[PDB]
Design a protein around this ligand. Structure first.
Ligand SMILES: Nc1ncnc2c1ncn2[C@@H]1O[C@H](COP(=O)(O)OP(=O)(O)NP(=O)(O)O)[C@@H](O)[C@H]1O
Ligand SMILES: [Mg+2]
Ligand SMILES: [Zn+2]
Ligand SMILES: [Zn+2]
Ligand SMILES: [Zn+2]
Lengths: 250, 628, 265, 387
DNA sequence: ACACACTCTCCAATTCTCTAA
DNA sequence: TTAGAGAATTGGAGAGTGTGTTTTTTTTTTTTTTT
């Protein structure tokens, strides 16, 4: 089964990346800033791209921006698939990170959203949407490696399983792929073939000047990944953006 | 004839309830409630004939809002719903749902019948809820019994604390692992009804679906801790508390220290012995499931307020009415009134913010009725606290580390009046806390694991007796009061009250106090003309909200002249600011937008009158008792 | 596995109980109370042992032998709460006044269940589910007197007394607030539309999860059971603690205490 | 972006459908409901919406029951193609790639199609006995694709012409496609039977095009000798067991076949050959999976039902209960969209259906028990039963 | 020993196929 | 064209086996001995 909305969003975001076509800061000449940003990333071997929400708002009567805003969690993989094709088209050197080279894990980023919420305004109706939040940092954790994609090999026979997906808990295969063997136990994680990500926990509290009458400040936990770890500092004031999620009891 | 729907174990038919509530909703008019009221003479024929709830529904449509209040007594007025009232109390869960679906259908019927422009899809999308209240007599917290389970209840109490919002699941989302088929599933009775096999026809496989957490749908839940009010506690015991569960709209309504009345079903549930197995314990937990919360405007109100403000004797009328039964002490009452009104809050783009609140100290001989006045101030104010000197610690007065921070008295009293009695008994260590809060109206904390600043817009009303426990005329006034200068400097008004013997005064006082015992529950009152407490509260609240005076050039000249006169001779910089703040408070009480020469002179006069300056020897600082 | 003889036969004592409830007078005393119970006016019955002693003496003076029921219910007090309840249920008179019977959910449920059985045919439920009253014993007057009349301090309550009816003197230390406790639990089967009950005595229990009804089974209807509060039976519960007087503590010792349970009115 | 926005409107409609079955108050607030039948027997259901909606209560009551009857299942040995995959799923092109591919196959058709098909078809007539399944399925799905594409292109624009694909009609290729379908059907090789079905469908469509403009009528008369009518009438009956694509191929072929013989003016003999129970069984079995199907196939199905019910006046076939369930499912707010063109046809059919059913049931009350079961084939009572 | 998770085994319910009237 | 006799495939009833469980601050109110 296939989701038509995802593919249409994918290949519309493709067109946005191709031909946003804003004119120059100084002259009436089409500049195509995001293709230039891809070229910049190619020059410096970067792995993240920044997008302005105002630019997305004016595109195609705002429907694409609405779809990205209200259902970010559904549509994030399709945006990645859309960006991969464009970077292949114009800068195939960026797709790889001598022996073979693994693929680059691109990151899309947004900024200049319409409004900033407080920690006190987080409510369960907004789960999975795109938001921005501000507060004071109070604690930070050390950087840890998070397992992103896994690969295992069977003990009782020479067989390999690859590209297992994790989500919130450490997860392992269900069968031995070789039908000559039935052992489910004694898997081992191949650290070389598997892939990891950088991961950091930080903790924030409300701004002091905003606290209502007779109340006390609430707190929140925030996750940082990729090239943004160790950017925050305790005691500083910061502004965040992302999506709020829900974490189980593992 | 046909199958029927019956509430389980009742033989109550849902059709009758639906039709009766529809008729009530679409034909009730307020006149019937006045028939049940004491007199038909109250009836306003023009207004009371109107269809009340149709008006409410039109307002709900055009304001884009979802919830309807309903005081249950109207069900008794309309003849067709007399029995529905009892059924509501006995079977809340089914009846309230019936009422909800009735209201939504009526809202649709209005637009389609009256053929209006409003989007039908929008109304179909929304949820509509009824919220009954004023159900009946309130019930003591300790007197709820097991025969009250699942019936509607009404409680009064005070709010201790509230937990943060908890996400509560309502809809589950499944996805097929192999073929990527998806299904949404309804949650009822707390159990997820997972499918046995993937429902796609060609992918009919077992164990093939799986849950996706962050694509589910959730709802807000919160738990509030309610404490028994002292009026009901048994003799020689301490108050108890009960827990309230609240959802969706009413989540973040209430803060610590609030005083409320609620309405909700009284529920009970089991609890497990261990998390591994289905073994339950014999004792059941109990809690309350609230559906409405209440705190314990019209042109006629504005007309009454404006008409009262035009009276010549307004200033004396308001002052003598805050504490009717207390004899004389007029200046003390006037100062307390000006504390109640308060100044104006000023904030700059740079250079800070300046307090509007007034601090008062009452000092003098015993038996002079200071604490009785503190009782009146404690009960008049919307928010506030009463406490004693020996009952207060430094932590309890401000804030408490428990890792979480917790509020003290001055924080709970934010925006109100904090009454402190036996002020002279608390130690210098405890009293040193009040410097920062009085000056800045903020509380700074720096302890292990917590460092922050909190706001405290709190007014202090203090009571004390002099050193030696009776005023000694052979010592100067500052030595009798005995508070250190850094703390005494922070009060706007300081009162001396003295137990001076005089036959003229004594006969009037004795006749006043003895008259209260001529009746079992006295009707007698000190003065012919006083305002009721409700209307006085309305006046003060409106004047606080709407009026914001500003200084005038004539007022500038008088303030400079008066401050220089008192200073040139001890008066300090704080005397000027307190004078401005008192003049602002005086201006609000007359509903003026400008502070004027009269207000400044009144503020000066009251400051001079409070500390008995006219009777004070200007050089030695002692008071001639003969001049009192 | 083994067995013994004992001097007591409960049939004779049951006969004595049912005679005592219908005969004794200071009409008979307790039939008035049971009439008030039937009228829904009264919630509890308090049995005096002074009445039983007087009854025994009067029966003896009439020239007939009788078992000493007083000592019998002091020695093994727990069993006789059930015997008296069964006797009361057997002998309960009919109401004197209209009641508005439809206010009771259990009446409607049991009437419908009986009608279902009647149609099907073209113990049912535990008797505890319909006992609208409580029952207590009151000890012997000491001035007529037996151990139940003589107070004991908390130290004198040895392990010999387990099972007996006694009296204790002391100071209360703490009291809990009231909460409900289950006695009979009610369920509903979704597919076959049939109700079943469960009785709870121990501190914990396992709820039912399968409809084992014979009709439901023979239709092979593996339906699901769900709990219901609206037809369950609760009873009020409270727990306290009592402690010996300080002026009775022997030298060098620490005071002792006992746990008290309270149910009903 | 425009079509994406329209699709988001459709998503909102589905969201609205979920909302209309969603309770206002939370999941543990719910009370309990009891429903009493005739004969005073009572049932129990939970949930707040059951209190008000009897339809939802009746559906929810049956939904709890555990059992489902286990189910029966046709092709293997060939990579993925139209024969064994749902082809409502495109593959996606760049603008340059789209125009380049269009240019390639357009030049192919205008240049190469006739010469290639003549050579390869006059090969296989001399080599049919030696064939393997690959070459049969290859030939039959090359034929179909290019004929269909030329028909659509000339439907669109006048610059194209139908003469570019005209080699398909000449007699040898017609004989060969016929022979492949024949031999595949006899040996019960169902994959080649499917592919031959698709090819023979396109030949009939092309004939109906050319008659709308000499030898083509001769080719028709030879295409509809009685033997071929026996085969083409036999085909939908066996389709009941097979995958969804097989039944759809049968339906579209049947539509084309009957329409061509409609425009021949024999007809009454041929139509009576088609109308009987097992064909109607296939049609209903196909129709109940409407959630996966196109807008057009349902139009074809209800065209056939109009033919059976109104024109031929063989009303007795459709008085069978599993059709009456389907019209409830398809016509409810559950299924077909309130504004799709399907609802016009469906409601206009159901009105007449229930009118005639009312008449029949009041004239003869025995049909109440009749509606559950198949019709009864006894000589003496069956004739009055059917009419 | 008392609820659970998981494995193993046998038996009969069901559909498919062939034969003759 | 119906139907009935024989063979093959599948479901889950239910019986069996193994398993797990009890159980150095830092902040704040109060009594006590020590300078
Ligand atoms: N002017 C007065 N009007 C009314 N009651 C008065 C007045 N003067 C004294 N009383 C009575 O005298 C008592 C004074 O009690 P109280 O309120 O404690 O005075 P106080 O100022 O608090 N003295 P103290 O607590 O020793 O510092 C009360 O019973 C009053 O009713
Ligand atoms: Mg006092
Ligand atoms: Zn293996
Ligand atoms: Zn699937
Ligand atoms: Zn059952």
């Amino acid at each position: 089964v296939d989701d038509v909305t995802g593919e249409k969003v994918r290949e519309a975001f493709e067109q946005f990346l191709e031909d946003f076509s804003v004119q120059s800061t100084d002259t009436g000449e089409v500049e195509k800033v995001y293709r230039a940003q891809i070229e910049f990333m190619k020059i410096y071997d970067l792995n993240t791209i920044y997008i302005d929400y105002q630019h997305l708002s004016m595109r195609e009567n705002g429907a694409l921006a609405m779809a990205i805003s209200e259902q970010y969690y559904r549509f994030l993989p399709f945006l990645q698939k859309g960006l991969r094709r464009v970077v292949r088209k114009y800068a195939p050197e960026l797709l790889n990170t001598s022996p073979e080279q693994t693929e680059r894990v691109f990151q899309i980023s947004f900024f200049n959203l319409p409004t900033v919420h407080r920690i006190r305004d987080i409510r369960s109706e907004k789960i999975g949407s795109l938001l921005s939040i501000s507060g004071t940092v109070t604690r930070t954790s050390e950087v840890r490696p998070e397992l992103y994609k896994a690969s295992f090999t069977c003990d009782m026979c020479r067989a390999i399983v690859d590209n297992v997906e994790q989500s919130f808990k450490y997860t392992e295969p269900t069968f031995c792929p070789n039908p000559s063997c039935e052992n489910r136990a004694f898997w081992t994680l191949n650290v070389t073939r598997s892939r990891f990500l950088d991961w950091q926990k930080v903790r924030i509290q409300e701004n002091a000047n905003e606290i209502p009458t007779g109340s006390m400040p609430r707190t929140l936990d925030v996750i940082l990944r990729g090239d943004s770890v160790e950017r925050a500092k305790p005691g500083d004031r910061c502004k965040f953006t992302g999506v709020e999620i829900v974490v189980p009891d593992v | 004839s046909e199958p029927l729907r019956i509430i389980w174990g009742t033989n109550v038919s849902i059709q009758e309830c639906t039709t009766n509530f529809r008729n009530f909703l679409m034909s009730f008019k307020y006149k019937f409630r006045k028939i049940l009221d004491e007199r038909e003479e109250f009836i306003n024929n023009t207004t009371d004939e109107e269809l009340y709830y149709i008006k409410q529904l039109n307002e709900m449509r055009e304001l884009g809002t979802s919830n309807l209040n309903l005081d249950a007594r109207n069900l008794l007025a309309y003849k067709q719903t007399e029995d529905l009232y009892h059924q509501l109390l006995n079977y809340p869960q089914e009846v309230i749902s019936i009422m909800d679906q009735t209201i939504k259908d009526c809202m649709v019927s209005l637009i389609v019948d009256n053929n209006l422009d409003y989007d039908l899809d929008e109304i179909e999308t929304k949820f509509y809820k009824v919220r009954p209240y004023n159900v009946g007599s309130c019930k003591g917290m300790r007197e709820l019994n097991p025969n009250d389970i699942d019936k509607l209840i009404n409680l009064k109490g005070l709010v201790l604390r509230s937990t943060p919002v908890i996400p509560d699941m309502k809809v589950a989302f499944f996805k097929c692992n192999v073929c990527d088929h998806t299904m949404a599933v309804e949650i009822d009775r707390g159990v997820i009804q997972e499918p046995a096999r993937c429902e796609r026809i060609d992918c009919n496989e077992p164990n093939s679906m799986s849950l996706i957490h962050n694509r589910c749908s959730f709802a807000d839940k919160q738990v509030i801790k309610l404490q028994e009010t002292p009026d009901f506690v048994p003799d020689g015991q301490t108050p108890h508390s009960i827990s309230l569960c609240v959802y969706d709209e009413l989540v973040d309504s209430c803060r610590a220290g609030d005083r409320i009345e609620v309405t909700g079903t009284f529920r009970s549930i089991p609890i497990r012995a261990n998390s591994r197995q289905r073994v339950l314990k014999s004792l059941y937990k109990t809690y309350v499931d609230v559906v409405h919360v209440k705190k314990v405007i019209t042109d006629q109100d504005l007309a009454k307020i404006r008409e009262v403000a035009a009276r010549e004797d307004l200033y004396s009328l308001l002052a003598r009415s805050i504490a009717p039964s207390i004899y004389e002490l007029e200046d003390v009452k006037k100062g307390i009134l000006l504390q109640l009104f308060g100044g104006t809050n000023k904030t700059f783009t740079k250079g800070g913010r300046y307090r509007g609140d007034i601090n008062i100290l009452l000092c003098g001989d015993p038996s002079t009725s200071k604490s009785q006045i503190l009782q009146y101030v404690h009960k008049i104010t919307p928010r506030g606290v009463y406490t004693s000197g020996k009952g207060s610690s430094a932590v309890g007065l401000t804030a408490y580390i428990t890792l979480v921070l917790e509020s003290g008295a001055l924080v709970l009293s934010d925006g109100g009046v904090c009454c402190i009695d036996e002020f002279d008994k608390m130690s210098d260590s405890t009293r040193s806390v009040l410097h920062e809060v009085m000056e800045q109206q903020t509380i700074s904390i720096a302890k292990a694991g917590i460092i922050t600043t909190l706001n405290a817009r709190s007014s202090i009303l203090a009571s004390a007796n002099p050193i030696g426990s009776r005023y000694n005329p052979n010592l100067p006034v500052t030595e009798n009061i005995d508070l250190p200068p850094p703390l005494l400097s922070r009060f706007d008004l300081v009162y001396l009250v003295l137990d001076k013997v005089d036959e003229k005064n004594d006969r009037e006082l004795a006749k006043h106090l003895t008259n209260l015992y001529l009746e079992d529950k006295p009707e007698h009152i000190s003065q012919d003309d006083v305002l009721p407490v409700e209307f006085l509260t309305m006046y003060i609240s409106y004047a606080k909200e709407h009026i914001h005076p500003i200084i005038t050039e004539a007022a500038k000249t008088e303030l400079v002249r008066a401050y220089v006169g008192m200073r040139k001779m001890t008066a300090t910089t704080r005397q000027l600011e307190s004078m401005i703040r008192l003049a602002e408070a005086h201006a609000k009480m007359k509903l003026k937008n400008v502070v004027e020469l009269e207000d400044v002179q009144e503020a000066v006069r009251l400051i001079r009158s409070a500390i008995k300056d006219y009777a004070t020897d200007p050089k030695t600082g002692k008071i001639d008792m003969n001049l009192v | 596995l083994p067995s013994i003889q004992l001097p007591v036969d409960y049939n004779n004592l049951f006969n004595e109980i049912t005679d005592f409830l219908v005969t004794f007078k200071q009409g008979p005393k307790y039939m008035a109370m049971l009439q008030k119970v039937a009228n829904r006016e009264l919630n509890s019955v308090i049995i005096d042992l002074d009445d039983i002693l007087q009854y025994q003496n009067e029966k003896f003076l009439q020239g007939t032998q009788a078992d000493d029921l007083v000592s019998a219910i002091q020695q093994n007090a727990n069993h006789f709460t059930e015997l008296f309840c069964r006797a009361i249920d057997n002998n309960m008179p009919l109401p004197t006044k209209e009641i508005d019977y439809k206010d009771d959910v259990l009446d409607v449920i049991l009437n419908q269940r009986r009608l279902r059985n009647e149609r099907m045919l073209s113990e049912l439920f535990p008797p505890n589910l319909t006992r609208r009253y409580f029952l207590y014993f009151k000890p012997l007057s000491q001035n007529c007197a037996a151990i139940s009349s003589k107070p004991l301090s908390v130290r004198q309550i040895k392990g010999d007394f387990l099972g007996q009816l006694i009296t204790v003197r002391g100071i209360i230390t703490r009291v809990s607030d009231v909460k409900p406790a289950v006695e009979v639990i009610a369920y509903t089967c979704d597919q076959c539309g049939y109700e079943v009950f469960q009785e709870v005595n121990s501190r914990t229990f396992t709820p039912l999860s399968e409809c084992t009804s014979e009709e439901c089974s023979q239709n092979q209807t593996k339906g699901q059971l769900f709990m219901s509060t609206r037809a369950s039976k609760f009873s009020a519960f409270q727990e306290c603690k009592i402690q010996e007087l300080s002026q009775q503590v022997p030298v060098g010792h620490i005071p002792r205490s006992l746990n008290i349970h309270v149910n009903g009115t | 972006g425009f079509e994406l926005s329209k699709l988001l409107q459709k998503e909102h409609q589905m969201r609205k459908n979920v909302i209309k079955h969603t309770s206002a108050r939370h999941s543990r607030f719910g009370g309990l409901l009891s429903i009493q039948t005739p004969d005073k027997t009572r049932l129990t259901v939970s949930g707040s919406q059951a209190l008000v909606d009897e339809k939802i209560a009746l559906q929810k009551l049956d939904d709890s029951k555990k059992w489902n009857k286990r189910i029966i299942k046709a092709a293997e040995g060939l990579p993925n193609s139209l024969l064994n995959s749902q082809t409502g799923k495109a593959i996606f092109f760049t603008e340059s790639n789209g125009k380049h591919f269009k240019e390639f196959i357009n030049n192919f058709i205008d240049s190469g199609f006739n010469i290639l098909l003549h050579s390869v078809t006059n090969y296989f007539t001399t080599e049919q006995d030696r064939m393997v399944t690959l070459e049969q399925v290859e030939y039959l799905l090359f034929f179909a694709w290019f004929v269909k594409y030329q028909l659509l292109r000339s439907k669109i624009d006048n610059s194209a012409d139908i003469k570019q694909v005209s080699e398909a009609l000449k007699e040898v290729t017609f004989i060969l496609v016929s022979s492949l379908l024949r031999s595949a059907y006899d040996l019960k090789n169902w994959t080649v039977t499917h592919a031959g079905m698709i090819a023979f469908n396109e030949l009939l469509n092309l004939v109906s095009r050319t008659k709308a403009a000499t030898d083509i009528e001769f080719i028709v008369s030879r295409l509809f000798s009685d033997e071929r009518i026996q085969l083409l009438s036999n085909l939908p009956k066996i389709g009941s067991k097979y995958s969804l694509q097989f039944m759809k191929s049968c339906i579209e072929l049947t539509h084309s076949v009957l329409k061509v013989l409609e425009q021949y003016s024999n007809f009454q003999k041929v139509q009576a050959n088609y109308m009987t129970e097992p064909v109607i069984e296939t049609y209903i079995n196909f129709l109940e999976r409407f959630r996966e199907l196109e807008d057009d196939s349902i139009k074809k199905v209800f065209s056939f039902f109009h033919r059976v019910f109104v024109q031929a006046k063989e009303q007795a076939l459709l008085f069978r209960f599993d059709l009456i369930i389907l019209l409830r499912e398809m016509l409810s707010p559950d299924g077909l969209d309130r504004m799709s063109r399907s609802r016009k046809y469906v409601s206009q059919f159901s009105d007449y259906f229930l009118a005639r059913l009312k008449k029949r049931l009041k004239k003869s009350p025995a049909w109440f028990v009749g509606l559950l079961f198949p019709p009864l084939h006894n000589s003496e009572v069956g004739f009055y039963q059917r009419y």
